[PDB]
């Protein structure tokens, strides 16, 4: 009988939860809190034709993939910014409070959509257009499409004079510098072939913010996105690192002191929230837990469901070369929160891409759900997971914070104190509404495998329990059905066990 104590004061630890960490890159069976336009086909988007190329993705393809695949209206195919607008739009329609927008800093952004871009076409040729962050004469809402150049500003400026600045209710909040530019040269060798230096991309993300900022000075901007760890700290060991890197822990560590650099010489922050892509490299069962991971392989499915903990926990190493070979840099949160205390005080964190694997698995629910406990305790700011609508639990892991009743409900937007006796066995966070804990919501996750887990509750508040409803998935299904209410609680104590891969929210009031 495996028992476990949660210990809850809601009067302790508080702190507010980002509404944006429960976001999502594609189109999920989700109710979600951020949308995010990103990843490899943005690149070299052009704006004003709506074009795009795939990269080694897909044959550097130019062509008119993201207007389909938004589901844009064949009508609007050829109107500037479509699939951007659509984008937007879609978002404001199901209420989405958070849309970012990557802008286009490789260089070049598709010309047009007749296909295959030869090595021979390499940027620049007739298959590319350049792009410029700042047009340095009158913008116009028709951008011409015949000269050679697209303006980062003049994209911003059409998008602003559509739905207001990011201050107002319906604006776009943030633009993101791009996408993975340390793989630039990898998956965009057509545009950016050779390997982005340090120098480079600060140069860059200096000129784009300024730009950006001129045009809406209410806009957020998200950078590096970087891909993974080796981009971290070395930016994929790039050309001149060996030198911009001196002084320097990791390559962290130099975006944030330059950006603030480049900052206080303008005279206004250039950088607002430090953007990094997190595939788990964990391992179990001789796999990684992402990307084509088995879910009959149990090992496999055990460790996803640890994955999390080195997001947050020092005593957790997971098996992977970074547990084994970056322990200096793990928990990975509290290292690039340490990072940004220490070079760019005020500075955002978010998490622009990630996926736990097991999607469709149990497995895939909880470590969700424990990830997004984890952004939300920790501080992170934005949040979106890269996947797709077959993604049947993972978006229950979402819904059980954004939508666990099927009609609004969710999780409060203010953390509290809540422990656990075993972080391997179990998780649990617990939060309320504003400075009210009159209702106190509780995230309680059982990654226990094959045995019910008994929970013993300790809760100090200032109200007096009397009813803890209950919503929760586990392996019978991905939807979220609503539990037997937990009714027998003296002096704010109670016990409940949960049964083996469970996942639930309990509303006490
Ligand atoms: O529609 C008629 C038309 O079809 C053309 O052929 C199409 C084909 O129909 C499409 O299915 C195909 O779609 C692919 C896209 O071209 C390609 O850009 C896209 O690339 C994805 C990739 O699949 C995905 O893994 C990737 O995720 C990465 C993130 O981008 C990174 O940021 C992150 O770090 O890492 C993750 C991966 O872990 O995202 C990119 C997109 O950004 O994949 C699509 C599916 O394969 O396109 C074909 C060409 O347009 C046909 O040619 C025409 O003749 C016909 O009329
Ligand atoms: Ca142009
Ligand atoms: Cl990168
Ligand atoms: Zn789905």
């Given at each position: 009988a495996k028992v476990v104590d949660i210990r809850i004061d809601t009067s302790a630890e508080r702190k507010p939860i980002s509404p944006y960490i429960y976001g999502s890159n594609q189109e999920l069976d989700a109710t979600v809190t951020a949308k995010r336009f990103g990843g490899n086909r943005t690149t070299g988007y052009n704006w004003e034709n709506n074009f795009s190329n795939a990269g080694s993705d897909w044959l550097h393809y130019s062509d008119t993939y993201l207007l389909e695949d938004g589901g844009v209206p064949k009508g609007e195919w050829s109107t500037p910014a479509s699939?951007?607008?659509?984008?937007?739009?879609?978002?404001?329609?199901?209420?989405?409070?958070?849309?970012?927008?990557?802008?286009?800093?490789?260089?070049?952004?598709?010309?047009?959509?007749?296909?295959?871009?030869?090595?021979?076409?390499?940027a620049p040729s007739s298959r590319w257009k350049e792009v410029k962050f700042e047009k340095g004469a009158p913008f116009s809402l028709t951008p011409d499409t015949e000269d050679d150049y697209v303006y980062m500003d003049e994209f911003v400026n059409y998008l602003v004079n559509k739905?207001?600045?990011?201050?107002?209710?319906?604006?776009?909040?943030?633009?993101?510098?791009?996408?993975?530019?340390?793989?630039?040269?990898?998956?965009?060798?057509?545009?950016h072939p050779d390997n982005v230096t340090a120098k480079e991309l600060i140069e860059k993300s200096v000129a784009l913010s300024k730009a950006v900022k001129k045009v809406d000075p209410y806009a957020e901007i998200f950078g590096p996105a970087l891909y993974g760890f080796a981009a971290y700290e070395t930016l994929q060991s790039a050309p001149d690192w060996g030198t911009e890197g001196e002084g320097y822990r990791w390559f962290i560590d130099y975006y944030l002191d330059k950006?603030?650099?480049?900052?206080?010489?303008?005279?206004?922050?250039l950088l607002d929230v430090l953007d990094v892509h997190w595939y788990p490299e964990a391992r179990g069962g001789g796999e990684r837990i992402c990307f084509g991971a088995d879910p009959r392989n149990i090992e496999t499915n055990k460790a996803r469901l640890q994955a999390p903990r080195t997001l947050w926990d020092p005593t957790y190493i997971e098996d992977s070369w970074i547990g084994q070979w970056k322990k200096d840099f793990l928990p990975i949160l509290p290292n690039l929160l340490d990072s940004i205390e220490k070079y760019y005080p005020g500075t955002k964190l978010a998490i622009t891409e990630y996926d736990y694997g097991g999607?469709?698995?149990?497995?895939?629910?909880?470590?969700?759900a424990d990830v997004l406990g984890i952004f939300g305790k920790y501080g992170v700011?934005?949040?979106?997971?890269?996947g797709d609508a077959s993604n049947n639990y993972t978006e229950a892991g979402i819904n059980l914070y954004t939508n666990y009743d099927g009609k609004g409900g969710k999780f409060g937007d203010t953390s509290?104190?809540?422990?656990?006796?075993?972080?391997?066995?179990?998780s649990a966070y617990a939060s309320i509404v504003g400075e009210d804990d009159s209702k106190l919501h509780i995230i309680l996750l059982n990654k226990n495998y094959d045995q019910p887990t008994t929970f013993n509750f300790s809760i100090d508040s200032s109200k007096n329990y009397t009813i803890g409803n209950v919503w929760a998935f586990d392996r019978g299904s991905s939807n979220i059905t609503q539990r037997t209410p937990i009714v027998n609680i003296k002096?704010?104590?109670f016990t409940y066990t949960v049964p083996a891969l469970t996942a639930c929210h309990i509303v006490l009031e």
């Open positions: 699939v951007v607008t659509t984008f937007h739009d879609k978002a404001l329609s199901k209420n989405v409070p958070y849309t970012l927008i990557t802008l286009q800093a490789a260089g070049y952004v598709s010309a047009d959509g007749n296909g295959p871009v030869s090595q021979e076409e390499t739905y207001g600045n990011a201050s107002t209710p319906t604006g776009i909040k943030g633009y993101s510098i791009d996408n993975q530019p340390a793989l630039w040269s990898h998956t965009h060798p057509r545009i950006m603030k650099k480049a900052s206080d010489e303008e005279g206004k922050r999607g469709n698995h149990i497995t895939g629910g909880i470590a969700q700011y934005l949040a979106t997971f890269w509290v104190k809540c422990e656990t006796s075993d972080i391997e066995v179990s002096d704010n104590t």
